[PDB]
Symmetry: D2
Subunit: 287 residues, 4 copies
């Protein structure tokens, strides 16, 4: 059955690079893309930035389905087509299927799940084809809803706590005054403090060298009335982003009703908010 | 009445640059272009070169008319669309009109007549969007058929002659041996020799300074049995290309049945052949 | 006296665009630039990203001064040269002058002061020539030290206060729970709360329409124990960035020893930190 | 001994692509290139075209040697440098060596010999970095003088002949009137006619199928008083360019004093002239 592959990925996820190599290897396959249509009807150049308009979007949408119809109603030579957009809008994604059935075509999805940190990394160098962070963020947030990834939301029963980070947040990567005050203000308030850190626990030869150093400084110098502490396991090289988000679902979320996140590294503040935890960023953390 | 503007011009003639500025100033106008569609269905990048295929052309054509229909069947907001191709194919150009009438739309043409010399000038710097000389040549040859420009073809009654050029052809810009021999070989053969030159005749103060110098060298040193001589009028700054093509229709074509053209400057050899005169190029003449 | 113009501006501030147009109009002027040299010795392409190395920087530096010497020791035709870098390093900037005097040349500065908001705007679209935010930030922070712009640092005598923002911070652009709690936690703690907002005060016909609405919501619904409130004057169209930074130096800084800034709009959080006030960003604010 | 590699190749021959990959693999190696320097001192953009000027060339030259000195006088870490230009000027090439010895450095050459047909192929798509055919031609002509390739010039004793081509020249790829006349005009004149062709002689099963067809048409229909005929051997897939230039040095040049070449395919007309044989091109032959 002639197929309609939808690529599912955020801007600069590989979608297009894939559809070109693929079509270049699989005869009978043709591409359909919104950005292309968007740029074409405006006669724009590479350095020109298109301006969103319902009227134009309507036209573009119009152009896709029609082209789908046209090409897919070709010979037996035509094996199918690729709708190389972000396709992160469920409302529309559904629309393509219900369109596909009423014509005898099947629908496939080719997913391009690239890590946020890597999506930013790429989108910033994307130049004129780059996209604003809120859209990139908004997009990724849909890529997660698609994948069915978890989003937190309190935990009835467990105490109301506030997770804190050390490097840069609690400490000035000596004590970072205002923030350390906060940890205690929240201490009075009736909150559980759960300090956390992405500093590797230690070295292969001594797997807690740094964890102990941290815990000591946190308690003895800063004097943070922590209730629990968690750190990056020794010999773990995954992203801070990935790392803490695991520590959450595995230790804190279950024994705690989280209300806040005090941190400083963007990728981490990005992760916190993204999953459902409010996060206040106390300093610039672009690294 | 909603309009369908067709741009008539050769590659790199201004077409697109026009349609962008225009649409950018005239609301209700949208663009339709083949190259765009061609690149899109292949998912190509700027550095990739598409490969002509009837099957794809058919698809592209399909995409244009359908998009025309779609957009033009919009509100009263839609004033019309631009078909920004070369549109130098009469067969198709007709097709758009006969399509336009059977839907209640008019058709307009925006012509971009740029000089050949300038088209090459641009196309060579066009980079990856550049096009092979024979297509550029073939294209321009259609742009002329469109404009209704003249193409020569003998002249019954008048003698059979061969036009010769001086700078570079007859002379080594001292005598250029083989070529000068030819002028006489054709002299025996029973041909009229009509020497011609784009060397300005002279200076404002002496409007034949060079014409005389030339004629003298041509007769006295080279010894070319010329029957007639023509040169660029003093104070004329138009192109060699333009220049000689006027001298032809005004002096030679009427009193002669031309069979050959011996020359050396590409733009001129290009012009000769282009209008209907066979031309042998005796040396590299890229200047 | 032959001159050595140094361009003073952050990445994507106009520097290069200026030096090209200038040299294009002023004969006897030649360009010297680090990025160029950096890319050249590595044989890099546009899509390649150079890697910082002292050894290479040393070489590049070496290349500039030598080229300066070489060209400036030309004829009377050579009027001078442009050192089109960021030149925001005082250590080096000094070096060029002390170099200039020991050879009989003067030094000029052409400054390109572009607003941060506009620098980000451009750098994000800069593509492969774009630069990381911390460097852009770090750079701008030097452009300010150059211009001699003010950086705050407490105010002895005046009470310790915390400035708060409304739209997005205190309010969910109904009340934003955690943040409003904070305003009171700091209220107990012994801090003065100085709410602030970039919401235009009102309309030409009623220049406080919104200021009153705000103040009411802030006091009556949120219940923030504010001590003072400031807002964007009616009919003011300058940037939020520019706006609040004026309200600070003119109303708060003088009557207050500021310790914190709770806000949400990046350009504003960027401004706060930049001038010397710690700022915690409570939510994504990329708009 | 620290080395100075000079790349020897025509525009778009691989030079730069090589020097980047190389430096990327061999630590201690740095690049020096004229075009870079040329563009930098003018502050030019990619779409801007530099304008040749002795004064600027002098400056650029100045910049290279100085940079050579500078970098090569680095530590033991510096293994050498690449002068990635065309380096087809012997006058200068010598200069680099005599410069190298007076400082204790050796000189190496990395040659990039790419076929003319392929150089044009590339240079036309080179876009703004492309170069005019006469320079490309002039360049290749130096690349040949470097390689020590042969250039013809008469052959005392042997008769004065004129080589003719069939496809497109003698025949209209039926007879091509004017050109066939010429073959006989030269026949009277006292010249030997040596017809030649790049049409494969035949098929594996019958290695002269086409050679016979040709010879028959040439003699029986056209009536060319040929004295000798040569064709592309069966099962030969090298370029027409390469092909005929071998047939020349192996059959004609030795038994003939060539005065002219009548042909039509550019790559071949290009080859003829290039080696020392005058060639008149009778028609457009861009294929
Ligand atoms: C950049 O952006 C373009 C698209 O890149 P890619 O990330 O692979 O696809 P997509 O953005 O559609 O997911 C390429 O030309 C690349 O060089
Ligand atoms: C080159 O080629 C593109 C099209 O140029 P132009 O000659 O104006 O239009 P067209 O080739 O359609 O006639 C532009 O981006 C320009 O910079
Ligand atoms: C982008 O970046 C390049 C340099 O831009 P510009 O901001 O004007 O100069 P600079 O970054 O040196 O201050 C240009 O080619 C422009 O199109
Ligand atoms: C084009 O021209 C540039 C130089 O190409 P190349 O032919 O490999 O080197 P060179 O022209 O120096 O011999 C590249 O960026 C390529 O994409
Ligand atoms: Ca941190
Ligand atoms: Ca001439
Ligand atoms: Ca706000
Ligand atoms: Ca031929």
């Amino acid at each position: 059955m002639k197929k309609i592959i939808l690529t599912i990925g955020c801007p600069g996820s590989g979608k297009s690079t894939w559809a070109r190599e693929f079509i270049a290897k699989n005869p009978g396959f043709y591409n359909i893309n919104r950005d292309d249509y968007r740029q074409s009807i405006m006669a724009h150049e590479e350095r020109d930035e298109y301006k969103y308009t319902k009227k134009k979007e309507g036209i573009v949408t119009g152009m896709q389905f029609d082209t789908a119809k046209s090409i897919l109603y070709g010979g037996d030579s035509v094996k199918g087509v690729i709708i190389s957009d972000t396709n992160l809008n469920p409302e529309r994604r559904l629309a393509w299927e219900t369109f596909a059935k009423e014509y005898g075509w099947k629908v496939e999805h080719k997913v391009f799940d690239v890590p946020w940190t890597e999506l930013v990394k790429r989108n910033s160098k994307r130049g004129t084809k780059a996209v604003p962070i809120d859209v990139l963020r908004s997009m990724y947030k849909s890529m997660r809803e698609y994948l069915g990834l978890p989003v937190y939301n309190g935990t009835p029963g467990k105490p109301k706590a506030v997770i804190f980070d050390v490097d840069g947040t609690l400490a000035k990567m000596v004590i970072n005054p205002m923030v350390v005050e906060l940890s205690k203000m929240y201490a009075l308030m009736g909150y559980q403090i759960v300090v956390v850190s992405g500093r590797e626990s230690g070295t292969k030869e001594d797997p807690t060298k740094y964890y102990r150093m941290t815990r000591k400084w946190v308690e003895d110098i800063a004097g943070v009335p922590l209730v629990m502490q968690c750190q990056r396991e020794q010999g773990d090289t995954r992203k801070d982003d990935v790392v803490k988000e695991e520590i959450f679902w595995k230790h804190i979320a279950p024994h705690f009703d989280v209300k806040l996140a005090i941190d400083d590294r963007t990728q981490v503040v990005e992760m916190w908010r993204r999953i459902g935890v409010e996060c206040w960023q106390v300093a610039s953390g672009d690294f």
